[PDB]
Design a protein around this ligand. Structure first.
Ligand SMILES: Nc1ccn([C@@H]2O[C@H](COP(=O)(O)OP(=O)(O)OP(=O)(O)O)[C@@H](O)[C@H]2O)c(=O)n1
Ligand SMILES: Nc1ccn([C@@H]2O[C@H](COP(=O)(O)OP(=O)(O)OP(=O)(O)O)[C@@H](O)[C@H]2O)c(=O)n1
Lengths: 394, 394
């Protein structure tokens, strides 16, 4: 009874999950939070958290590795999946990790320095602790590689693209891809003749247009800072406005980077929280700035959804996903009501249902475009890739 | 037989036009190009250009004023219109110029330092040379003031908006407004129950959604640098990408401002020209980068048009205007073909017709949304405001 180990080495943590090959179910999950700080701890399944403070990326994975042998499943690890933040132009699909792949991930690392080097540290450790175990790299960018130059080029001088690699990459590709495949079954659509809009909505949020099974447009750009307004990220912002602010407050681009990336978005406008459940209740309690933060959030989602719809020959479905998209009855309705121009009629009974109802259609019959909620499963998609690649001869 | 004098004091020039009150026709037009430089000249109607080199804003208008008396129409100037680049939150409509208005334009001048101070210099001169002549201020921003907070707020921290005035303003308001009023007659629409998308396309380009006679969304932001890719302007650009470029090339935000504002857009990608007629022929001659510049330009127009459509209850018409929108048979078709998702069928015979055919519908019958070309007339709209305000008692 083989299992697959899914690893995600973020900026400050190592999120892991153990999935059964037979059913793709989660048998174990956890997080090694507080990395590179004098308070590193390992919490599993929401139970008693072990410590091993200020431990490196290699030792933190080694701590989990010992917990796997403690529960007699080290001998059952057949495959290991690694989520990679950035795959540049070099990666269009998931690959088996080899020396070549490590070099290539290290080559595109300058495009996302914080996150990619953490991923490489995660690869390095897992290769040490599991030598005879096949390992797979899954990229957040690879799904958006089917984008045409018109869709990925910026208005900047050509030199920046050809000589520096400045272009749209887009993120949440694994989520967007997974949700898409699932949407073809739920909506009984032909993949080869389909047009979908996927709204991945969480703390990090992006829109993606999927024409005929391929990504044709996505809201995030070279960085996760473009497109939708998010939890702490501002989203689309006038560069002329940013230059003006710099002249007035005396702040530099590095200073404004932190403001835009960590102090903006839902957190920025409301001045309360990045969390929606907080702001939904805050507005319910008559908070003015919380209502405006949500209404702006909703507005910019509808603008991009409808914008991304232009990259389709025909619009068949709009799919909501992510912590917000799966659980927010309000935001979904507000966004859909904001898209009456496309002729969406919402079934509020169906939209009222909590995430426990899983994959579900939330639009009425008279609606021209089908609306649905599909819970994303990035771990499952990484596992499914590893299972597929486990049959390959290298 | 009264006339109206329309003045536009740009960054480097003074564009003027004399319009007849009876028919709103142009009787005289010209430009005082090369302002504040040792080569200032005054060219009228495309005839012999006078000089008066390195002349100030007051003297350059005084040079035109002498040419008006030379053609016996100084005694006929009943009204004078001034185009103002930025009206902040203070101006929602066109006003008669008084001491109060001058103070207020000077108050919002920090929002557009280059252009507003030139406008104030233009007001100052015209007040000197024409003391008993009523003068009107027409703002590029005033039409977009009907925008809701959700549509004009950025994702930035709240403090930047409330304490510094950082918000979307949008431009080409006079064009967008004029084209809208004209679109209600051509499309036989009820203004109080209508939804239009106006694509003002020139060297400076912007989209505007007009719901029920009011602007509800527009592509440009606090500055003319947001939204569509343009002639020399990049348009929408990832701020995370701009910060990354700064770290790599060692350039500052002030340096990148010039790159984004003057070296980007159609000029940036193609590396040839900002002019479309050049690039259309360049692509016809098999130039690769020119084709990509146009295809990107087209792509970003369709993305914003469809994006702005979300701010409408119903989409009735899409209206093309500006040097590009009025004259480009190719770009119009490419953009419309890129919006098949909204069900636009193009009549290519009607789209083939040159601008001489003026206001014209270019979409077929089976098309769900009407497409039309309406030549903008900013001077005429400024005159129509002045005529209206000429009846007022002050
Ligand atoms: N029952 C829930 C759970 C989550 N949320 C909201 O969903 C957001 C978090 O989404 P999530 O996908 O879990 O974010 P991440 O885990 O960080 O992943 P990502 O940001 O990439 O989407 C929060 O704002 C939270 O308010 C919600 O509305 N109701
Ligand atoms: N017969 C013509 C004339 C103009 N153009 C194009 O239209 C653009 C200029 O548009 P215009 O509205 O005249 O620009 P401006 O006068 O500067 O005003 P704005 O930029 O604000 O629109 C140029 O790229 C030019 O190639 C065109 O396609 N065919």
């Amino acid at each position: 009874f083989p299992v697959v180990l899914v690893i995600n080495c973020g900026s400050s943590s190592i999120k892991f999950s153990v999935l059964d090959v037979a059913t793709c179910d989660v048998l174990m999950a956890g997080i090694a939070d507080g990395m590179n700080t004098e308070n590193a701890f390992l919490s599993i399944n929401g139970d008693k958290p072990i410590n091993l403070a200020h431990s490196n990326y290699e030792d933190a994975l080694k701590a989990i590795a010992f917990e796997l042998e403690k529960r007699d499943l080290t001998d059952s690890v057949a495959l290991i999946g690694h989520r990679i933040a950035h795959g540049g132009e070099l990666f269009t699909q998931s690959v088996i990790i080899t020396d070549e792949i490590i070099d290539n991930i290290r080559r595109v690392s300058p495009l996302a320095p914080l996150h990619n080097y953490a991923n490489l540290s995660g690869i390095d450790a897992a290769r040490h602790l599991f030598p005879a175990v096949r390992q797979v790299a899954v990229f957040d960018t690879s799904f958006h590689q089917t984008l045409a130059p018109e869709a990925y080029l910026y208005g900047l001088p050509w030199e920046y693209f050809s000589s520096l690699g400045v272009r749209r990459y887009g993120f949440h590709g694994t989520s967007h891809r997974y949700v898409s495949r699932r949407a073809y079954e739920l909506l009984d659509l032909d993949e080869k003749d389909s047009g979908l809009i996927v709204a991945h909505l969480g703390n990090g949020a992006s829109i993606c247009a999927v024409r005929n099974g391929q990504s044709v447009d996505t809201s995030m750009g070279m960085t996760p800072l473009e497109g939708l307004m998010m939890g702490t990220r501002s989203g689309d912002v006038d560069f002329g406005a940013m230059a003006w602010i710099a002249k007035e407050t005396g702040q530099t681009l590095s200073d404004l980077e932190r403001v835009v990336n960590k102090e903006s978005g839902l957190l920025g406008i409301s001045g309360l929280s990045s969390d929606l459940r907080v702001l939904e209740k805050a507005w319910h309690e008559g908070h003015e700035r919380a209502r405006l933060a949500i209404k702006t959030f909703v507005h910019r989602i509808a603008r991009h959804i409808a914008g991304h719809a232009a990259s389709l020959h025909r619009l068949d479905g709009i799919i909501f996903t992510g912590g917000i998209g799966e659980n927010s009855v309000l935001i979904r309705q507000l966004v859909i009501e904001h898209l009456g121009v496309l002729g969406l009629t919402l079934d509020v009974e169906m939209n009222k249902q909590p995430n426990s109802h899983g994959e579900r259609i939330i639009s009425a019959n008279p609606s021209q475009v089908i609306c649905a909620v599909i819970p994303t499963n990035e771990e499952k998609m990484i596992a499914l890739d590893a299972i597929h690649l486990g049959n390959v001869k290298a």
